[PDB]
Design a binder for this molecule. Structure first.
Ligand code: MG
Ligand code: MG
Lengths: 217, 116, 45, 110, 54, 109
RNA sequence: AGAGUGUAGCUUAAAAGCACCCAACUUACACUUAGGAGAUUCAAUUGACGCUCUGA
């Protein structure tokens, strides 16, 4: 039966910025703090922060604070980069730096003649071209950037077949170990969907059923 | 007794086993004995995630071999936490190595190193 | 679920009183580590 | 060499005398044990979400390998093949921040 | 059984292993439900049925 | 060069077979390793020998082996079998014949 | 559109028995101890809310 030879590429981006805790975790992150503190024994810091000042009032009966006021002046010194470089952009769906605590999947819009549907970046493959290199042929056919992707395997994930001449579309995988997104203002419409925007741009049962193997977390 | 129908009712050693190249024989393809290194500068965050991946292999039925450590380097001590793993399918080598990757707490570095 | 294995404690009994020290390795990649005399911002060249 | 560091530190023997004052209040042990309950309810679902995906991602992968088999029976012999280039595999854990500014690039390293 | 786990001081004693149950009250409820079916074992075990109702 | 090896047979084995009437203390089966385990009304010796404890009739059954928890050479075996497996040994019972005594009238006071 | 249907994850279970969660001992696992939550999808065997696919 005639299938239109077309795979896809569900790219994953690993978020490099850790998600901040829930306050329900933080009460337990406050409770796991103190129990770590009490169950110990005679630390080197308070051996030289307590027993010196009892001996110093002992000579006053007849310093580690300048350490403690200097070491706070390096935390106020080094300006922490925020977890939030996302609300200052807040529309920048074309940038990989759009959301930083969540994982990102590329989604380039295209156009057909008989249909007009937002798509995951496709792969018109050759039969004698293997399926795995077809995933490598996809990063380097349209976007032409130097995104350092690595892969998982030649296993598929989910076969979806919208037929008109049959079909089968093979949803593959990749991970952005790094990315050199040259000409980031490309001609296209690449939208970095975390998770919740899959129902915002991919409507049907053939593209809002990709969701069962994207990393929710 | 040997002449009886209940002969060998009490044999038990055939339910115990009382005593590596990669298994890709023709179609059944498995990985060899892996190592999932875990490294940080914390005694907790190097052992806490390496307690996780053991209990995740226990739930997802993967034959763990070892959970030892490497002796530290003076550079403040470097902590290494190495989980040996045998047994991965075609299908499972993806779903393991992603959820393992996606659940590292804080700057902890990974590995699919192997034996020798 | 990278908030899972981070909620923890030094499990040991022969353990000191350690403080949530912030460490940069090479490029501002700051992460928490338990460490004494809390200098509270670090780096390596 | 079978040398490690799971030994006890030899300087930790003598002056263990800091906090024998280990006593806790009766209503404070309510909320503390009410939290360790309500965290024990928390991690049960925090596990049960992950165990949902460990099936729900999985059954499609067998289904696609069934939907690879029927239409293309030469080629479900290469979905069971394995990659060699995972041998120095690595992913570092996520951080607090995008990395930095340009500079200031210093430590004394002793 | 949901309501008893809604009073907060009801589970105060429960986590201090020190709550109690009154045996007079359970008894006059025990014979309501299964106190008949418990007496059937006891009269079977004491051999009443195999002797007095054949 | 092969010396030794001249020992006589130890004459161990079943003394009282199944169905055989037994009196209390009659040795049922002398053994060197535990081949038959002691069942109801059957005791063990120091030399692993089975002797009857009541007057009755010797029966051999196959029973489910649950060892003692303080027996680690056979508990660490028990914690190694697959999840449906159950061990069986053969046991020697004595179904006691005579009752323990009857109430007899001694006097009419 | 329809066919199958459905006790919390499974039950040739009738509100249960295992899995499962967490804390303490464990190198970790395991064991054990302390704890933790769970359900008959509705209405008179029965018809309409949920899932799975057969089709468009
Ligand atoms: Mg001889
Ligand atoms: Mg002789």
């Amino acid at each position: 039966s005639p299938w239109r030879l077309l795979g896809a590429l569900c790219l994953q981006r690993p978020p490099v910025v850790s998600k901040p805790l829930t306050p329900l975790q933080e009460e337990m992150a406050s409770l796991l703090q103190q129990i770590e503190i009490e169950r110990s024994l005679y630390s080197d810091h308070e051996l030289r922060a307590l027993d010196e000042n009892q001996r110093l009032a002992k000579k006053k009966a007849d310093l580690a604070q300048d350490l403690e006021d200097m070491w706070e002046q390096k935390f106020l010194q080094f300006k922490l980069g925020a977890r939030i470089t996302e609300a200052d952009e807040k529309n920048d769906r074309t940038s990989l730096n759009r959301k930083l605590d969540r994982n990102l999947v590329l989604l380039v819009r295209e156009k057909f003649g008989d249909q007009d549907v937002w798509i995951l970046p496709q792969a018109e493959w050759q039969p004698g071209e293997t399926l795995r290199g077809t995933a490598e042929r996809t990063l380097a056919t349209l976007s032409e950037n130097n995104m350092e992707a690595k892969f998982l395997g030649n296993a598929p994930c989910g076969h979806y077949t919208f037929k008109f001449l049959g079909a089968k579309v093979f949803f593959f995988k990749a991970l952005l170990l790094t990315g050199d997104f040259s000409q980031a203002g490309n001609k296209g419409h690449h939208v970095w969907v975390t998770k919740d925007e899959l129902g915002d741009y991919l409507k049907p049962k053939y593209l809002a059923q990709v969701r069962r193997f994207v990393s929710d977390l | 007794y040997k002449t009886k129908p209940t002969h060998g009712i009490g044999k038990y050693k055939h339910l115990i086993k009382a005593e590596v190249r990669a298994i890709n024989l023709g179609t059944d393809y498995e990985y060899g004995v892996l190592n999932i290194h875990l490294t940080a500068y914390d005694m907790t965050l190097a052992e806490s995630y390496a307690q996780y991946v053991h209990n995740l292999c226990n739930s997802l039925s993967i034959k763990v071999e070892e959970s030892y450590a490497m002796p530290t380097k003076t550079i403040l001590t470097t902590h290494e936490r190495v989980v040996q793993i045998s047994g991965l399918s075609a299908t499972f080598a993806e779903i393991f190595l992603e959820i393992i990757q996606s659940s590292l707490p804080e700057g902890v570095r990974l590995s699919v190193k192997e034996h020798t | 679920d990278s908030s899972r294995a981070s909620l923890t404690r030094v499990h040991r009994q022969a353990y000191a009183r350690l403080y949530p020290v912030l460490l940069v390795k090479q490029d501002g990649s700051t992460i928490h580590i338990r460490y004494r005399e809390p200098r509270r911002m670090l780096a390596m060249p | 060499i079978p040398i490690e560091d799971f030994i006890t530190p030899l300087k930790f023997l003598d002056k263990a005398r800091e906090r024998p004052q280990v006593e806790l209040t009766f209503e404070e042990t309510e909320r503390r044990a009410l939290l360790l309950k309500k965290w024990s309810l928390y991690k049960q679902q925090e596990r049960k979400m992950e165990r949902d995906t460990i099936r729900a991602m999985l059954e499609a992968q067998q289904e696609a390998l069934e939907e690879l088999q029927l239409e293309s029976p030469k080629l479900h012999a290469e979905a069971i093949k394995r990659d060699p280039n995972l041998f120095p595999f690595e992913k570092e854990g996520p951080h607090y921040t995008p990395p930095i500014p340009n500079y200031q690039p210093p430590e004394g390293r002793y | 059984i949901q309501e008893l786990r809604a009073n907060v001081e009801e589970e105060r004693a429960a986590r201090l292993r020190t709550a109690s149950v009154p045996l007079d009250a359970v008894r006059a409820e025990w014979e309501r439900t299964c106190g008949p079916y418990h007496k059937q074992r006891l009269a079977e075990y004491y051999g009443l049925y195999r002797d007095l109702f054949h | 060069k092969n010396l030794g090896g001249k020992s006589s047979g130890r004459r161990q084995g079943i003394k009282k077979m199944e169905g055989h009437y037994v009196h209390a203390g009659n040795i049922i089966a002398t053994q060197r390793h535990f081949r038959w385990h002691p069942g109801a009304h059957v005791g063990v010796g120091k030399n692993k020998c089975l002797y009857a404890l009541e007057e009755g009739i010797v029966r051999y059954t196959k029973e489910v082996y649950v060892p003692h928890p303080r027996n680690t050479e056979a508990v660490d075996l028990i914690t190694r079998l697959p999840k449906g497996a159950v061990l069986y040994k053969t046991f020697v019972h004595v179904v006691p014949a005579k009752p323990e005594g009857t109430f007899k009238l001694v006097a009419m006071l």
